[PDB]
Amino acid sequence: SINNRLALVMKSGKYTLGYKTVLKTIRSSKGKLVIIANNCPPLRKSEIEYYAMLAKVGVHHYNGNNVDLGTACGKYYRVSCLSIIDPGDSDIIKS
RNA sequence: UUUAACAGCCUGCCCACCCUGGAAUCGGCUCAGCCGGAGGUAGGGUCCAGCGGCUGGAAGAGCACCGCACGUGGUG
Ligand SMILES: [K+]
Ligand SMILES: [Mg+2]
Ligand SMILES: [Mg+2]
Ligand SMILES: [Mg+2]
Structure with a gap:
């Protein structure tokens, strides 16, 4: 699974959680x-x-x-989708 | 010790909905619930109810009281 790699992003990378912000990052190409x-x-x-x-x-x-x-993102609320802005440590490469 | 249907304007309950924004040190919230990355709190809006407000209707009416005559005037 990607839970280990995803956990690294939660503390070292940039990300947005939620549907509205994910579309925003795609529009701005972030x-x-x-x-x-x-x-x-x-x-x-x-x-x-x-x-x-x-x-x-x-x-x-x-x-x-x-x-x-x-839960994988270490949050106490549901996440339907998310976007990774800064991978942090080897997340976009091996996917 | 009063104010109809109806007409216009205003108001905008409790909900619902929209825009901005992106929340853990989690917060908001009911008598009770409960709600939030499927986007909360917050800020600013839209809509809906009315047996709500103002004006017109409408004081010219009604009621009370005091007169003059035996209909008529005044005050509230
Ligand atoms: K009627
Ligand atoms: Mg609001
Ligand atoms: Mg009037
Ligand atoms: Mg009168």
Whole structure:
């Protein structure tokens, strides 16, 4: 899994959690990798992927729901999707 | 010791909704709940209810009281 690599970003890299900020980072091209939970709304999932394809940003489908993804990020709330701005330590390379 | 339908304007309950923004030292919140990265708090807006407010209707009416005549005037 990517929980170990994702944990490193939470303390050494730059990221935005949530659907509204993820679109913002894709619009400004600050996002380098987008991670989406498996229970994300199907329409929202397609919209994010279309945005990422338009901005030439890689998309990773997380193996877990928004509850699991939020826990992986070390947060006490659900996260449907997130964007990584600064990888920090070998997250965008091996994905 | 009063103020109808109706007409215009204002107000904008409890909710719902929109924009900005991005939250752990978690916070907001009800009598009770409960709500928030599926975007809270906060700031600024939109909409909805009315058996709500103002004016018109409408004081010319009604009521009370005091007169003059035996209808008519005044005050509130
Ligand atoms: K009526
Ligand atoms: Mg608000
Ligand atoms: Mg009046
Ligand atoms: Mg009168």
